Design a binder for this molecule. Structure first.
Ligand SMILES: CC(C)CCC[C@@H](C)[C@H]1CC[C@H]2[C@@H]3CC=C4C[C@@H](OC(=O)CCC(=O)O)CC[C@]4(C)[C@H]3CC[C@]12C
Ligand SMILES: CCCN(CCC)S(=O)(=O)c1ccc(C(=O)O)cc1
Ligand SMILES: CCCN(CCC)S(=O)(=O)c1ccc(C(=O)O)cc1
Length: 1402
């Protein structure tokens, strides 16, 4: 052990000296076999694994050649070393055996290295963990020999120069080899760099650099985010989940069947298989993350020990200089290793969470396409979309939290043990305090969650009322109702503000508890430890290692209740998900899709039922249809024709009797379903584009005139936003899609509901007629009209869920029996300006005082640490300072006082912040709501309603929820950083200089991160939204998809969308880890520079200063990273204030009241005069009304029907001053609208909208929200509207609840209510507007009679497009191209040489 080197093996005497150097024998002994030992103990395994499983990949690039060249240079160097050693035999007496046995080992090990490097070419990771770790170990274990040789040669020791020079060259080449191994290999551009990067890069996430640079120069486009590897793509993980889930689902299903049969001898579903299956399918990543976290946790408790060693070294005045530096270097190395481990664990955990969300969403979709009818009925579209949107996120969060709920326990236990070893059994006081603080955290978390749910509900109701307000802003501005509809939502917002303030107070309390736990624990533990006994003393090692352990334990202590609460929530979410997935699949035994048969349709005594709990809807049926034969099944309402079609599709359950169907089928229902996108893609429906067939199906249907009518043309847009296509157009496009799909059989279910006579007849003749495009294709038609009955070739009559007889129209006219009576019954007819705006909303005094009080908190904290330093120092002297109860009591009291001052200052800061942010949100929403209203109608016409609704929902929610927390967190992080830096610089002022470059470095990283992160965030928001929406689109129209047999196409599309979102979210996760590695390196650099400065100045500052400098420099590693992430979040969610301020500054119309007031009756019950008028719908675009002048007398029923131009509809808009009059004005009995107010004039003028809309709520304020009319007057008003009967049958009174939809307040009721409102307005000027011919004639007759009998004395306008109801007008006005050429009564109009206008009487 010593004879083989001819030198001293171990000698601690050299170490125990100011200039210490390790013995050369041990140095060439152990520091040489350690890297070679690591290499030779694993090289066979790596070589075998690579050579056994390998492809034919092989290339020779610059890197492979360079690494091989340098390794053979190492080979040559070891060879010449051996040559020199053997030659020196005659130089000396007997060379030591080491001098000539090391070169042989180096030769063999470099041959092994050459083989390893060559073998790596087969694999895909060129520089894997083995080689990089070997190089790192070699460099680290050789730096000792390098320094020893250089130190020996330094002191003029001219001995064996050649060997030293050769070792220097070999070490330099090893350094360059490690440098090369760090670099990522050249890329094949067929895989994402995450899988082809070198081990050091994959550890340090430097392979992301390119993307970040790509984000800084130009905005990131969805094509610039690298794809994910095939491991995480939704198809692969979903297949793995299904494989590992089928067995568990079968076991749970059999157990559920056994339980049900035992109970019987709906709330029970096969459960407790989702968690088992997910764990079984992800156990590998679960284990990798668990081991990585365990290593990091065992590695996080080395920093306090190193700090204790450093304090002990500085305290001793005879300590060796060569120490201390070793402690600082070790602290840097441990922090680096721990940061690498932690970030890799985070990447593993987050990617596992994202994969869990992917597999759950994809399994949801795959189940939605085969769910049985009953299970589909048990849910709803909104609820199921919410399930996929929310429960999957809950499961992802639970996955992220499960790997941490155990690491927190390990960290707490180890930290408790180490605190015990430091401070004796007196840490139980700290244990008690910080355990009593845990149920408080749990309770606060639960209360916060409940208040958040209540806030969500209130925000939903506010969104609903806001959307209703914005949809019908037209009539709202017409009737001058803005103050009332503003006050209602103002009250709702006040209630939401109260709830939000409560939530903010609870969050502030929770964060105050988290921030004050370490201070309270420190005070209590130190006080109890000193007071419990006089023997034990508090020195700088115990106190500051204990503070470091308290800081280590603060987070996992406060992250237990949150994780627990989230786990108990995900429990219910998992139960819901596995209740959905466990529902049985739909049955296909009855409906057999036989490949080849006769007539393609056979009803083998089928008996289908909507619900087994009820009587069979249809039973004992028998019908066969020849191929190519049109069948028009008809019957009474509710007979079961729609039920018959559903049974044909197989969307219903049956008791007995199978149905045999052959060939492909197409189907169109009465309720047409339209996907999001283009009309073209709707028509193709995933089939190949064919211009000929496309043109044919446009010609066959009525779509070309509609397409030319459409604004966007063939592409245009439809769905979601769309253009609000009419029902007839939807039916037409669905019929066209069915025709294009060219199936063998067609199932038409009332596709001509909102279709006129001639157009529907043409469509039938050209599509489903004898000469239609589907002559060779059989069709089963459901119809209600009689025009198409003569064209049927096989008509079946359906009654009470049972067919009666078959036949054709010839049978109809021949039998004169059942068919005759049936037919007879049938036809009977950013920049700082935005931050300034938000802060000004907050209030400058409030932010000034918040900043001042947080600064006072940090000053108190620095004072507390200085006092602890002095308290620990007083033990070293022991020259009368101690051994007195007064001194110890004063120390304890002042320490407690400083802790209390810090606590109350921080609490005052946070409470003031909460109140200021609440006030700011209130003011911002008030301003935005006030200014959106009273805005001119042009702004509403241009901007879509969805845009303003999103501005009121999402941006206001951001401003009220995520902006205060982000700004407070930024201030917290920044003042933590400033306190720590000004407390490190208080000991060694030289450190101030190192702030100059470090900050610059930090700044650089931040900039790059921001310039990418924003974009990634945006990309996520752009791609997450479609998935959910598509799910709705594929779950509302499930019968259509099942009929067309296009299931796999929809499944593939959903998988594609999931992958497109997955790549964005994965790139975001990696960007977070990239920034975290960089900034944890910056914080670690801060702690290492501080430790080096403390060691250098060890002869000036005592050990207590080292303790309180390092114990806080160790806490800065994460604060920098979180400061940058909070800066990025503040930049991301400040755009809400930007948009709100953009919408506040919108233009406003004429003011409410312009000083001058009208008399008691502004209309003066008299005439009106139109002077020279020059008015356009929007300014300087195109004048509409030009060169018109007229005078309408009192009580005149003046009607105007000009032409098809917009000039017909302009007058009303010009009568309420909605359109500003550029030329002339309007005189009404000497009263000019120009020189008078606006809202007062609109309030006392009436108008019937052409498209009236309803306001949600009651019926009293939907009629008169101002409540300025007595209930008797309102009742009389409905009495002339004869709506008294409807409300009397409904909830009696004026305050009956009303809502949208046809359930309540049907179209006739709506028209009656509008007429009543108009007649009770009681203004002498009446303006009408009619645009729809679908209104019932009785309603028109009654409103005309009541107008003529009540409003005859009042002037009326009657803007009516129809001609058959205007001859009764007293006067008729005609306006052409914006000009009037005639004036007089209808008799005078027809007196002009005979029908000179409105000639067309039909
Ligand atoms: C992305 C989601 C998970 C939001 C995460 C919130 C964190 C980014 C915020 C919330 C609480 C903040 C922490 C709360 C307390 C502090 C104490 C601070 O150290 C001190 O100030 C000493 C204690 C004292 O001053 O009394 C270091 C920053 C830190 C960890 C803050 C860093 C940023 C945190 C973790
Ligand atoms: C929602 C997860 C909660 N966590 C558990 C992770 C295993 S977490 O520890 O608090 C954390 C850490 C780091 C980041 C980040 O870098 O964005 C986010 C969250
Ligand atoms: C949400 C905050 C996340 N951080 C805490 C900052 C105070 S963190 O630095 O990223 C971190 C650190 C350590 C552990 C662990 O030990 O499990 C987890 C997360």
């Amino acid at each position: 052990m010593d004879k083989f080197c001819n030198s001293t093996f171990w000698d601690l005497s050299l170490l125990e000296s100011p200039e210490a150097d390790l013995p050369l024998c041990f140095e060439q002994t152990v520091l040489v076999w350690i890297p070679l030992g690591f290499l030779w103990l694993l090289a066979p395994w790596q070589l075998y694994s690579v050579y056994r499983s390998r492809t034919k990949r092989s290339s020779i690039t610059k890197f492979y050649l360079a690494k091989q060249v340098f390794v053979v240079f190492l080979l040559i160097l070891a060879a010449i070393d051996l040559s020199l050693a053997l030659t020196e035999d005659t130089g000396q007496a007997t060379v030591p055996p080491v001098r000539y046995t090391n070169p042989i080992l180096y030769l063999c090990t470099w041959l092994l290295v050459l083989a390893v490097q060559h073998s790596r070419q087969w694999c895909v990771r060129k520089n894997s963990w083995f080689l990089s770790l070997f190089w790192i170990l070699s460099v680290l274990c050789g730096v000792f020999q390098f320094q020893t040789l250089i130190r020996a040669l330094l002191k003029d020791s001219k001995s064996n120069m050649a060997y030293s020079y050769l070792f220097f060259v070999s070490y330099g080449f090893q350094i360059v080899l490690l440098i090369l191994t760090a670099f990522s290999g050249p890329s094949d551009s067929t895989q994402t760099p995450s899988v082809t990067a070198s081990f050091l890069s994959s550890i340090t996430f430097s392979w992301y650099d390119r993307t970040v640079l790509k984000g800084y120069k130009h905005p990131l486009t969805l094509e610039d985010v690298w794809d994910i590897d095939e491991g995480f793509k939704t198809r692969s993980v979903t297949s793995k989940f299904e494989a590992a889930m089928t067995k568990d689902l079968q076991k749970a299903r059999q157990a559920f069947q056994r339980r049900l049969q035992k109970s019987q001898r709906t709330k029970d579903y096969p459960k407790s298989w989702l968690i088992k299956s997910l764990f079984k399918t992800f156990h590998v990543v679960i284990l990798k993350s668990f081991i990585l976290k365990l290593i990091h946790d065992l590695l996080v408790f080395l920093n306090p020990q190193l700090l204790k060693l450093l304090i002990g070294f500085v305290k001793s005045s005879n300590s060796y200089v060569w120490f201390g530096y070793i402690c600082a270097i070790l602290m840097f190395a441990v922090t680096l290793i721990q940061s690498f481990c932690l970030q890799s664990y985070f990447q593993h955990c987050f990617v596992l969470g994202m994969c869990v969300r992917t597999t759950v969403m994809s399994s949801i979709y795959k189940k939605a396409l085969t769910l049985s009818n009953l299970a589909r009925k048990q849910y709803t579209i909104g609820e199921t979309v919410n399930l996929m949107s929310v429960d999957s996120q809950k499961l992802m969060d639970a996955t992220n939290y499960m790997q941490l709920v155990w690491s927190s326990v390990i960290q707490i236990t180890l930290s408790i043990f180490f605190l015990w070893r430091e401070l004796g059994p007196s840490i139980l006081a700290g244990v008690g305090v910080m355990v009593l603080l845990i149920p408080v955290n749990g309770v606060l978390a639960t209360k916060i969650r409940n208040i958040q749910v209540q806030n969500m509900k209130n925000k939903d109701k506010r969104l609903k009322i806001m959307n209703e307000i914005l949809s019908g802003i037209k009539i709202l501005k017409y009737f001058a109702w803005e103050p009332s509809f503003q006050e209602q939502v103002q009250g709702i917002r006040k209630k939401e503000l109260k709830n939000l303030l409560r939530f903010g107070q609870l969050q502030s309390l929770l964060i105050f508890i988290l921030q004050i736990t370490p201070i309270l624990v420190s005070v209590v533990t130190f006080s109890v430890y000193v007071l419990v006994d006089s023997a034990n003393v508090l020195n700088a090692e115990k106190a500051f290692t204990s503070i470091t352990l308290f800081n280590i334990l603060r987070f996992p202590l406060s992250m237990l209740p949150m994780v627990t609460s989230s786990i108990l929530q995900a429990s219910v979410s998992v139960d819901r998900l596995e209740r959905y997935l466990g529902g049985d699949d739909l049955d296909t035994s009855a409906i057999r899709r036989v490949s080849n048969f006769d007539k393609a349709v056979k009803f083998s005594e089928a008996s289908f039922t909507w619900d087994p709990d009820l009587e069979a809807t249809i039973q004992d049926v028998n019908l066969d249809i020849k191929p190519g034969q049109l069948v028009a099944v008809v019957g009474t309402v509710g007979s079961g024709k729609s039920s018959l079609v559903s049974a044909m599709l197989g969307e219903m359950e049956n008791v007995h009797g199978h149905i045999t169907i052959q060939g492909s089928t197409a189907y169109v229902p009465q309720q047409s379903w339209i996907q999001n996108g283009t009309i073209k893609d709707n028509i193709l429906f995933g089939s190949e584009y064919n211009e000929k067939k496309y043109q044919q199906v446009l010609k066959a249907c009525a779509l070309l005139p509609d397409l030319e009518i459409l604004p966007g043309g063939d592409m245009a847009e439809i769905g979601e936003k769309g253009i609000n296509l009419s029902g007839g157009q939807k039916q037409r496009v669905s019929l066209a899609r069915a025709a294009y799909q060219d199936a063998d059989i067609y199932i038409l279910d009332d596709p001509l509901s909102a279709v006129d006579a001639h157009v529907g007849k043409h469509i039938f003749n050209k599509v489903v007629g004898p000469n239609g495009l589907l002559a060779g294709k059989t069709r089963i038609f459901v119809t209600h009209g009689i025009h198409f009955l003569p064209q049927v070739d096989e008509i079946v009559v359906l009654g009470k869920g049972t067919i009666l007889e078959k036949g054709s129209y010839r049978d109809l006219l021949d039998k004169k029996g059942v068919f005759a009576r049936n037919w007879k019954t049938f036809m009977k007819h950013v920049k700082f300006s935005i931050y300034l705006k938000y802060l000004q909303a907050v209030g400058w005094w409030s932010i000034l005082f918040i900043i001042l009080f947080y600064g006072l908190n940090n000053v108190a904290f620095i004072g507390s640490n200085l006092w602890l330093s002095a308290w620990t120092s007083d033990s070293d002297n022991l020259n009368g300072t101690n051994n007195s109860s007064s001194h110890r009591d004063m120390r304890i009291g002042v320490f407690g006082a400083l802790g209390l001052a810090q606590g109350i200052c921080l609490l005052i800061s946070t409470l003031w912040s909460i109140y200021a942010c609440r006030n700011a949100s209130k003011a911002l929403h008030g301003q935005l709501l006030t200014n959106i209203l009273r805005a001119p109608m042009r702004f509403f016409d241009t901007t879509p309603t969805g845009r303003i609704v999103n501005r009121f929902s999402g941006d206001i929610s951001t401003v009220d929820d995520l902006l205060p927390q982000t700004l407070r967190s930024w201030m917290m992080c920044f003042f933590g950083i400033a306190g720590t830096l000004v407390m490190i610089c208080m000991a060694t002022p030289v450190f101030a200089i190192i702030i100059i470059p470090l900050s610059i470095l930090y700044i650089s990283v931040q900039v790059f991160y921001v310039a990418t992160s924003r974009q990634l965030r945006r990309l996520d928001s752009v791609t997450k939204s479609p998935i959910y929406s598509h799910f709705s689109e594929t779950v509302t129209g499930l019968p259509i998809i099942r009929a067309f047999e296009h299931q796999q196409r929809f499944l593939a599309w959903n998988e594609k969308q999931i992958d497109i979102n997955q790549k964005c979210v994965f790139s975001w996760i990696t960007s977070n880890r990239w920034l975290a590695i960089r900034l944890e390196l910056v914080g670690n650099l801060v702690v290492f520079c501080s430790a080096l400065l403390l060691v250098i100045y060890r002869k000036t500052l005592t050990g207590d200063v080292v303790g309180f400098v390092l114990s806080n420099a160790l806490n800065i590693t994460q604060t920098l990273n979180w400061l940058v992430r909070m800066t990025s979040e503040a930049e991301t969610n400040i755009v809400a204030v930007e948009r709100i301020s953009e919408y506040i500054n919108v233009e406003n119309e004429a003011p409410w009241v312009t000083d001058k007031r009208p008399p008691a009756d502004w209309p003066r019950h008299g005439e009106i005069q139109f002077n020279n008028y020059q008015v356009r719908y929007r300014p300087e675009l195109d004048l509409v009304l030009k060169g018109i002048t007229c005078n309408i007398k009192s009580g005149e029923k003046v009607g105007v029907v000009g032409r098809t131009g917009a000039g017909k509809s302009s007058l009303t808009n010009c009568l309420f001053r909605i359109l500003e009059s550029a030329g002339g004005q309007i005189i009404i009995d000497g009263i000019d609208v120009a020189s008078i107010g606006l809202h007062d004039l609109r309030e006392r003028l009436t108008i019937i909208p052409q498209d009236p809309i309803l306001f949600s709520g009651s019926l009293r304020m939907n009629l008169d929200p101002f409540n300025k009319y007595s209930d008797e007057e309102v009742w009389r008003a409905l009495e002339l509207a004869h709506l008294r009967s409807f409300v009397s049958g409904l909830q009696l009174g004026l305050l009956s609840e009303v809502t949208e939809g046809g359930d309540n307040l049907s179209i006739g009721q709506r028209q009656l209510l509008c007429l009543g409102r108009a007649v009770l307005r009681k203004s002498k000027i009446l303006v009408l507007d009619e645009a729809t011919a679908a209104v019932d004639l009785e309603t028109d007759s009654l409103i005309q009679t009541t107008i003529r009998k009540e409003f005859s004395q009042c002037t009326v306008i009657t803007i009516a497009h129809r001609l058959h109801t205007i001859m009764d007008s007293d006067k008729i006005m005609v306006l052409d191209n914006g000009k009037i050429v005639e004036y007089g009564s209808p008799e005078e109009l027809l007196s002009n040489r005979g029908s000179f206008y409105l000639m067309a009487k039909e």
